[PDB]
Write a protein that binds this ligand. Structure first.
Ligand SMILES: COC(=O)N[C@H](C(=O)NN(CC[C@@](O)(Cc1ccccc1)C(=O)N[C@H]1c2ccccc2C[C@H]1O)Cc1ccc(-c2ccccn2)cc1)C(C)(C)C
Lengths: 99, 99
C-alpha cells in the first residue's frame, strides 16, 4: 500500500499472538517496542534518540507481522515512548520512500 | 525518486542559504536541525523522542529545499543528535511510504 504522511504512519502489528499499534519509522535503525514478554534469551543494547539513550533488551529472530506482511527479525524491548518499527524490519517487508 | 531503506535515508537540503545533510524521518512529527541561525521570530518548544525531551527554538514559515523539491514550513533548531526532516515537510515534497 501507499501511506501518505499527513498523519502518523501508525499500523497494526502482530507479535506473540497479540495485536499492537506501531509507527513505521524510516529514521529508526532498529525496532523497539514497549515492555512486553518474548521467548528466549536476550542481549543488552543501548539505543540513542532525540533525548539521549535508553537501555533495552534485544531478542533475535522474533516473528512479527506488520500490516499483514510477515517478518522475522530483531525486536528491542524497553522504555520507549512509543512502539517503533525500524529499517531492520521495514526492509523485510519491502518498504521504500517515494516522491 | 525511490529511496531504499538498506541504509539511512540521508538527503541534502538547502536552508538558510546553507547546505546540510538530513534524515528523511517518517517517525518524526517535526523537522529539527542542529544549531544554526535562522531569520525571523521564534518561540521555545519541548520535543520528545527516544531518551526524553530536548528544548529547541521554533521558527515558522521557513523556505527549505529537499532533493530539489522546494517547500516551506516550521523548522526546529536545537541539540538534536542528528538533522531530521519530519512529516511536516515530507508531505510537502509528496513523500510516501510504499510496500
Ligand atoms: C541510529 O539511531 C537510531 O536510529 N535511533 C532510533 C531513533 O531514535 N530515530 N529518531 C526518530 C525517533 C522518533 O521518531 C520516535 C518517536 C515517535 C513518536 C513519538 C515519540 C517518539 C522520534 O524521536 N520522534 C520525535 C521527533 C524527532 C525529530 C523532530 C520532531 C520529533 C517529534 C517526535 O515525533 C531519529 C534519530 C536518529 C539518530 C539519533 C542519534 C542518537 C545518537 C547519536 C547519533 N544519532 C537520534 C534520533 C531508535 C528508535 C532509538 C532506534
Amino acid at each position: 500500500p501507499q501511506i501518505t504522511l499527513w498523519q502518523r504512519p501508525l499500523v497494526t502489528i502482530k507479535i506473540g499472538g497479540q495485536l499492537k499499534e506501531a509507527l513505521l519509522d524510516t529514521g529508526a535503525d532498529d525496532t523497539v517496542l514497549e515492555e512486553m514478554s518474548l521467548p528466549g534469551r536476550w542481549k543488552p543494547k543501548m539505543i540513542g534518540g532525540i533525548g539521549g539513550f535508553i537501555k533495552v533488551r534485544q531478542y533475535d529472530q522474533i516473528p512479527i507481522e506488520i500490516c499483514g506482511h510477515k517478518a522475522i527479525g530483531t525486536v528491542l524491548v524497553g522504555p520507549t515512548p512509543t512502539n517503533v518499527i525500524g529499517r531492520n524490519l521495514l526492509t523485510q517487508i519491502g518498504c521504500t520512500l517515494n516522491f
